[PDB]
Design an enzyme around this catalytic site. Structure first.
Site, PDB file in Angstrom:
ATOM      1  N   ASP C  54       0.842  -1.208   0.000  1.00  0.00           N
ATOM      2  CA  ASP C  54       0.000   0.000   0.000  1.00  0.00           C
ATOM      3  C   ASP C  54       0.876   1.258   0.000  1.00  0.00           C
ATOM      4  O   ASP C  54       1.531   1.564   1.002  1.00  0.00           O
ATOM      5  CB  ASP C  54      -0.942   0.009   1.207  1.00  0.00           C
ATOM      6  CG  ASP C  54      -1.977  -1.107   1.205  1.00  0.00           C
ATOM      7  OD1 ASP C  54      -1.592  -2.248   1.307  1.00  0.00           O
ATOM      8  OD2 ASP C  54      -3.145  -0.806   1.262  1.00  0.00           O
ATOM      9  N   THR C  87      -4.611   4.551  -4.542  1.00  0.00           N
ATOM     10  CA  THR C  87      -3.680   5.564  -4.006  1.00  0.00           C
ATOM     11  C   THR C  87      -2.392   5.663  -4.830  1.00  0.00           C
ATOM     12  O   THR C  87      -2.091   6.716  -5.388  1.00  0.00           O
ATOM     13  CB  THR C  87      -3.306   5.263  -2.542  1.00  0.00           C
ATOM     14  OG1 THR C  87      -2.583   4.028  -2.475  1.00  0.00           O
ATOM     15  CG2 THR C  87      -4.557   5.163  -1.682  1.00  0.00           C
ATOM     16  N   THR C  88      -1.783   4.501  -5.068  1.00  0.00           N
ATOM     17  CA  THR C  88      -0.517   4.407  -5.820  1.00  0.00           C
ATOM     18  C   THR C  88      -0.701   4.988  -7.225  1.00  0.00           C
ATOM     19  O   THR C  88       0.128   5.769  -7.682  1.00  0.00           O
ATOM     20  CB  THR C  88      -0.018   2.954  -5.935  1.00  0.00           C
ATOM     21  OG1 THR C  88       0.103   2.384  -4.624  1.00  0.00           O
ATOM     22  CG2 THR C  88       1.332   2.906  -6.631  1.00  0.00           C
ATOM     23  N   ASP C 380      -9.945  -2.755   1.564  1.00  0.00           N
ATOM     24  CA  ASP C 380     -10.142  -2.176   0.225  1.00  0.00           C
ATOM     25  C   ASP C 380     -11.274  -2.838  -0.551  1.00  0.00           C
ATOM     26  O   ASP C 380     -12.102  -2.156  -1.143  1.00  0.00           O
ATOM     27  CB  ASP C 380      -8.847  -2.270  -0.587  1.00  0.00           C
ATOM     28  CG  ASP C 380      -7.707  -1.411  -0.054  1.00  0.00           C
ATOM     29  OD1 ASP C 380      -7.959  -0.573   0.779  1.00  0.00           O
ATOM     30  OD2 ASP C 380      -6.576  -1.703  -0.363  1.00  0.00           O
TER      31      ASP C 380
END
Lengths: 513, 513, 513
Positions: C54, C87-88, C380
């Site tokens: 993450d 996010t990444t 998630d």
């Protein structure tokens, strides 16, 4: 007892550190190996920048501390002296050979067993190479240019390998004469930044880095009669302690005038010889240069003994001691001796020799480092041509040899059996690092290439295989004219296996600061 | 940005350092593995000396810095929690698995391919173990003692494995009751230096490390009626803020005498319950001990909650809150409750329980470190007996499993093909480190043993093989009664392969100081 | 004026350092992105080892100094709060967006022009995503499991994505009730090392990390009547300053006996309520536990307010203040309340709730870091299921969106013209970093994939494209069930473009030590 800073390794740690040191070097140099290999930039403590791909050169220049890496350098220098190229391939295959030796150490195979299988596999490997060796004409123009070109490839000079192959084959042929012995010392490599590689050219004679000593002397001499004096052309005085003893105000003048006559007569004798070009190994006094100009004799002083010999060989000039001894039988011939400026530097070109035993190759290019790489490329090109002239056996490239060896040595291993079969199997497998790093550096699939090439090798043969990284596929190296001297491959096996056995035999290393 | 002292590794260096760190641990612990394995002495910063052979214990105690070695410790702790033993074998085979993964990295096999073949080979390996698993009676006396004994071997306690196997099989049977679930917490391991291992004995009840609170109390009570109080037996005062309010010089005495009656009545109720042995989790006021002695009630205070529970389970005593609530239905039975001194230390032995759910094993020996090793040996012995009771599958030892796996996984590799065959072949070969280090540590020929055992395994089978280092030759592990729980072997495969895939998945490690 | 150590950047240097800092983070995290992405190991100053993939977690844990990298972290935390994953992808595409902004700075495109084209392209990009968005049933079982599974992929938990998809879809459905609003707080994630991921299971009720306060209480209660008290169950004393005023040696006893009656009566009222299971948020005095045992009431004290609420929601238990107020109408139902040990740790499982508004998922696995990764994967998974329930629009994965956008935004650029066309073209091209790093990390040809996918996208469409790295070829993401919530993609565009405009707007950064 021992200086702080001294390092010592023994038993398992000596063997580990030695295998590491050797493989570490191999890890460094293997990234330069192959047509798709890169180059290294080594800049010393003064700022001097060395840009090269040559493994042995990198090893000579770099700062090595470990004794084991220093012994590998000695191996690289032997390969340099003998064949010039194939140095990197010797280091790499030796590095893997130690890697595989470490696997055997992991298997608890006694060091005397490891080296036993290596000695056995290396003996058979030599027999295998001699068996597959393809015999060619020692003076065959065609194979001479084919060997030359394959050597040139993977260098920056490959772009002009066609012109270079012609230059190098011609250069070697000119100086080799009989059949034969090839002496690389007979081919002078001159390199001068300026112009491009297209301007590089072979000059049948000698390029002398000297100038015409007098403004009164011709700038060019045709059908030149060259004399080689090793004595200094100055007002000679006796070795013994002596001085002029004046007896009269008239005699003061008589002595000065006498010395003028002495030196004038000397030059008159040089002229009487029939000479009109003169090279002196030692100095020439300005007064002598003044008289030399009178007879239209062009001269160069302080000539290097090495070039005095290249002049004797090329022109057929005979080095003479006394000017009084100089005769027509001592004079050599040059079609043209002419003073030329190359990127400003004034040189004397002695060219168009009748039957030269020495030849000079003038290399041009946009930068020093470029013409330095070309100089290394052509040094190796001449080397391997000389290798194929003296040893009229060649073998297919593209890793076909090492593959052929790994095939037959695997069957050889099975024949041997015992714990020796483990060591022999390891030796045979170690040879695959070369095909492996060829493809890895080429950006080709390491696994799929090695499988497809070995499959093709076993099915079609060693004259119907190897990797062609140029098209990026397994091909026929033999039919494609991709061959190298046998000596390259057989010397690699000998020196690598024997130096590896040495390293493996060392179990205690003491490195003083 | 980063504190000086912080280390960080990434890409190739992270993978190298992680494989090294893991294998380095494996290199350290593998010298203890096997019947001929040695022991380690770890002495902390205070002088405390730990002498052991247990891999997980060595890893817990030693000072590890590298994050990768710390994750391997987590693997060792899982193996400790689940089965107790087989920890070292999990580390070693994992260390080699990383070694073989490094070979694949040398072959340029993408990390996702390596872990793909490992995941595949591990899935088949589990199926193979379940296939060869030999089903046995969960409560079969014979196999219970056979599992026990094979676990004990390779320890200092092996000299007495016959007495110990009887003790451990009996201990587990006594506390397990139904069929079933085995809880190792029901078997208390007491260890007291003095005497020898021949004096070690199982006591059907609980050994309490307490003494008889009064000199007036009996030293031994037969047909004991045991009470368990968790309240403190002292002059109770209200929780709320209160104090005695004197109203007369007579009342000063009445209050003191009133408090004496209160505590006297309490003890009178304990006696009225029929109790003559009393264990209190909390304190007992000396005044209460004075009254307890009057009725011939033997008592011990400040008893550990853990032992209060072992007493409830063994004796069938029921923990009671109020003394007024204590009844005969709350009392447990003990055939004998007697105060005994062991190497001077006064303890109370509660033994001869009717139907105990807890049992205590008293271990003796010439030194603390000796009885500590025995304590670890019998902990594992109980563990693996519990493993074979709950999971009634066992497998042959002597490396037969790992060999059987390397056989079928090699054929499995060929079936798979592609680059996955390389990874699967590497996995199968990695399993051979265990047979390899068994023989190496045994002082047997690593090569000849591995060849002869694999040949014998393939020809005769997995129930007609394995290495017997005890006679120093390949033998029949199955017929020789050399078997271990299936769970040991299957859990090793799961945890090792999955934690290896994790390590191999990490390509960036940041270790702050 | 300024402390030594303070750094300040301005104008061109501020813009360069800010673009670098952001892209540097993107360079670090992008190696984790994708099914073939790797994981990172961050070990703090105490030795605590964090193993994760993450991006936002890596950013929270790592030591960032540059203010620009700190603002990117704020972006990552917004993405975490809203959707959890993606996010990444937000960081990476933002990093490239800055890279392309630097190209525009190299082109001398004024910062207000750059952000103008970005604002324009981002506005159209949102319209494009909403246009291609595929509408699905908010409560459709099928798409619920499809969204769930595609989220799970690229994690270690993917191996069990089938069981997990069932668990997460069931968990969300159970707690969501009406249509609707999804609150992730209603799903408790419990993680306990031991067993494997196969043992992970959903429990329709609440797992309480507490034990049965008395040995006399039942170990399991069926058809449980659960009470929730928030008061402490102890001998209550008035808030006001008071103390017991003894008047007689008899009264000393009357007060103690009076307090015993008080607490006894309290418990008698709890029993009178019909309750047999009791959870108290505050403490329970041992004396109260003594009386609670008398009526066979099982109890747990010091319960976390958070779990007191999860119990109220699941069981339908009503939190009550006074014990006297507790009635049957306040009691909740649990099919079974039972004390269970998980890897030794004693917990109370409240399960089989009639109509629970809260559900608990118990995660097992071989290691803490494994069950921590699973915990992040399922967090998630629940997130994105909630995203698709609330926002019933999904889009095709495999980089199809970003490709579709780069197609239409290139034509949009041409429509706009001027210097704005340069900025809009740069925005559209920046979106290709995601497809680019997907293939790069997958070990696929970056160029050939991007060409073949874009060609296939333009010819067949966005529902007939994207990269399937799983088979390692361009495929049909839509037909293959490879879809993600629209919100993921649209929120990424909004937050990334607006935070990028901010960074690009900053031309002076002062970072005090």
């Amino acid at each position: 007892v021992l200086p702080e800073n001294m390092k010592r390794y023994m038993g398992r740690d000596a063997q580990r550190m030695n295998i590491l040191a050797g493989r570490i070097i191999a890890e460094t140099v293997r990234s330069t190996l192959g047509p798709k290999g890169m180059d290294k930039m080594l800049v010393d403590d003064l700022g001097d920048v060395v840009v090269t791909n040559d493994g042995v050169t990198i090893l000579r220049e770099m700062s090595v501390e470990h004794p084991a890496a220093k012994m590998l350098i000695e191996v690289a220098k032997t390969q340099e002296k003998e064949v010039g190229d194939g140095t990197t391939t010797a280091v790499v295959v030796a590095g893997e050979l130690l890697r595989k030796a470490e696997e055997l150490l992991d298997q608890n195979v006694h060091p005397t067993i490891v080296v036993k299988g290596y000695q056995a596999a290396a003996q058979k490997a030599q027999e295998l190479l001699k068996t597959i060796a393809c015999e060619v004409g020692a003076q065959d123009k065609e194979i001479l240019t084919k060997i030359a070109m394959t050597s040139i490839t993977g260098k920056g000079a490959e772009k002009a390998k066609e012109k270079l192959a012609e230059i190098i084959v011609e250069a070697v042929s000119a100086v080799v004469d009989d059949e034969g012995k090839v002496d690389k010392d007979l081919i002078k490599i001159e390199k001068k930044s300026g112009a491009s590689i297209d301007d590089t050219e072979l000059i049948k004679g000698v390029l002398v880095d000297k100038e015409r000593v007098s403004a009164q002397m011709p700038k060019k001499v045709t059908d030149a009669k060259i004399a080689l004096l090793n004595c200094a052309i100055e007002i000679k005085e006796t070795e013994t302690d002596a001085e002029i003893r004046i007896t009269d105000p008239a005699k003061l003048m008589e002595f000065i005038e006498q010395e003028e006559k002495m030196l004038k007569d000397m030059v008159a004798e040089i002229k009487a010889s029939g000479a009109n070009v003169l090279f002196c190994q030692k100095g020439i006094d300005d007064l002598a240069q003044h008289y030399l100009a009178k007879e239209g004799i062009v001269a160069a002083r302080r000539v290097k003994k090495s070039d005095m010999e290249k002049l004797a060989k090329a022109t057929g000039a005979n080095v003479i001691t006394n000017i009084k001894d100089l005769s027509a039988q001592d004079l050599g011939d040059a079609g043209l001796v002419e003073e030329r400026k190359i990127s400003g530097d004034s040189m004397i070109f002695v060219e168009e020799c009748k039957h030269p035993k020495a030849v000079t190759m003038l290399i041009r290019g946009t930068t020093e480092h470029v013409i330095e790489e070309v100089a290394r490329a052509v040094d190796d090109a001449v080397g391997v041509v000389g290798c194929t002239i003296e040893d009229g056996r060649i073998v297919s490239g593209g890793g076909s040899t090492e593959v052929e060896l790994s095939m037959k040595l695997r069957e050889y291993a099975e024949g041997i059996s015992g714990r020796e079969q483990l060591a022999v199997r390891a030796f045979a497998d170690a040879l695959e690092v070369i095909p492996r790093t060829l493809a890895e550096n080429a950006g080709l699939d390491a696994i799929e290439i090695l499988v497809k090439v070995r499959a093709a090798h076993a099915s079609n043969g060693n004259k119907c295989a190897g990797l062609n990284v140029f098209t990026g596929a397994v091909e026929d190296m033999c039919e494609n004219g991709v061959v190298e001297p046998l000596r390259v491959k057989t010397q690699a096996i000998q020196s690598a296996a024997e130096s590896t056995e040495m390293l493996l035999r060392i179990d205690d290393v003491i490195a003083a600061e």
